[PDB]
Amino acid sequence: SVLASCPKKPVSSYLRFSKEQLPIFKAQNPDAKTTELIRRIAQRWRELPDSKKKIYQDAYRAEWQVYKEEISRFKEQLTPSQIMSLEKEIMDKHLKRKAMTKKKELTLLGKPKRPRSAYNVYVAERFQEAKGDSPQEKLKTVKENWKNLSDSEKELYIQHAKEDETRYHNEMKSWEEQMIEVGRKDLLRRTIKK
DNA sequence: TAACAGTCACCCCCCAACAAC
DNA sequence: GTTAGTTGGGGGGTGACTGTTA
């Protein structure tokens, strides 16, 4: 809301060079990986004479003065309700990035998935053939079918979930022991269910 | 820290139900 | 009690990789 129209900080020298250089390198090397083009761009920035870098730096200093002006002008027009909604948006965006960074590290570290419930088991088996066009309609079908299962049929799902709670217990015991060996005791559970 | 960007390989959120903090 | 992560796919999104700077 407020954060969308908020003036944004200017781009520093190298990033300004990189933005202009990447389309040129991408034109001349269309099947190359961007990571590799960025590595060459950064080598070109390092070799660049200081008199050329200064040209970029001077524009940055001047863009920073425009920024101070825009950000003062913006903030001054804001009501306390706006400021407050701006600070919440910034907080939410920060929290969401922090949580995604923590999740990607757990995937990189090979963390075992949580146990699958008898219901998760049923969604896995039943989804493909469940009536519905879109995945949201098919899930509404599945959930209703789950509601109507006999004890006889529900037992199969209950037994698959029992096995997965054992796999979860085994996998966790060894992953936690490995996290300790790599010095990541912060990743371990505080509480474990009996 | 997070600004620029293309690609990869997930991640989150919706619809729903069902251990760890 | 509340949050987060799971089974399913698909829309819409982003951190890691490649870098430097303020």
Swiss-Prot record:
A Gene Ontology annotation in the biological process aspect, one of them, is: response to hypoxia
Q: What disease has this protein been linked to? A: Mitochondrial DNA depletion syndrome 15, hepatocerebral type: An autosomal recessive mitochondrial disorder characterized by severe intrauterine growth restriction, neonatal-onset hypoglycemia and liver dysfunction, mitochondrial DNA depletion in liver and skeletal muscle, and abnormal mitochondrial morphology observed in skeletal muscle. Hepatic pathology includes cirrhosis, steatosis and cholestasis. Progression to liver failure and death is rapid with no evidence of neurological impairment or other organ involvement.
Which GO MF terms does the UniProt record name?
Answer: chromatin binding; DNA binding, bending; heat shock protein binding; mitochondrial promoter sequence-specific DNA binding; mitochondrial transcription factor activity; RNA binding; sequence-specific DNA binding; transcription cis-regulatory region binding
Provide the species name: Homo sapiens
The entry's localization annotation reads: Mitochondrion; Mitochondrion matrix, Mitochondrion nucleoid
Which residue spans traverse the membrane?
none
One cellular component (GO) term of this entry: cytosol
Superkingdom to which the source organism belongs? Eukaryota
Put simply, this protein is called Transcription factor A, mitochondrial
Site Intercalates between bases and promotes DNA bending — annotated at 15, 139
Q: Which residues bind DNA?
A: 7-75, 112-176
Residues where Phosphoserine occurs? 12-13, 18, 117, 150, 152
Instruction: Report which gene this protein is encoded by.
Output: TFAM
What domain comment accompanies this record?
Binds DNA via its HMG boxes. When bound to the mitochondrial light strand promoter, bends DNA into a U-turn shape, each HMG box bending the DNA by 90 degrees.
Alphabetically sorted, this entry's keywords are: Activator, Disease variant, DNA-binding, Mitochondrion, Mitochondrion nucleoid, Phosphoprotein, Primary mitochondrial disease, Repeat, Transcription, Transcription regulation, Transit peptide
Role, per record: Binds to the mitochondrial light strand promoter and functions in mitochondrial transcription regulation. Component of the mitochondrial transcription initiation complex, composed at least of TFB2M, TFAM and POLRMT that is required for basal transcription of mitochondrial DNA. In this complex, TFAM recruits POLRMT to a specific promoter whereas TFB2M induces structural changes in POLRMT to enable promoter opening and trapping of the DNA non-template strand. Required for accurate and efficient promoter recognition by the mitochondrial RNA polymerase.
Indicate where the modification Phosphothreonine is found in the sequence: 79
Q: PTM per UniProt? A: Phosphorylation by PKA within the HMG box 1 impairs DNA binding and promotes degradation by the AAA+ Lon protease.
Give the record's subunit note. Monomer; binds DNA as a monomer. Homodimer. Component of the mitochondrial transcription initiation complex, composed at least of TFB2M, TFAM and POLRMT. In this complex TFAM recruits POLRMT to the promoter whereas TFB2M induces structural changes in POLRMT to enable promoter opening and trapping of the DNA non-template strand. Upon metabolic stress, forms a complex composed of FOXO3, SIRT3, TFAM and POLRMT. Interacts with TFB1M and TFB2M. Interacts with CLPX; this enhances DNA-binding.
The answer, when asked if Amino-acid biosynthesis is one of the entry's keywords, is: no
Part of the full-length chain shown: 44 to 237 of 246
Q: Per the record, what is the consequence of mutating residue 119 to A?
A: Moderate reduction in DNA bending
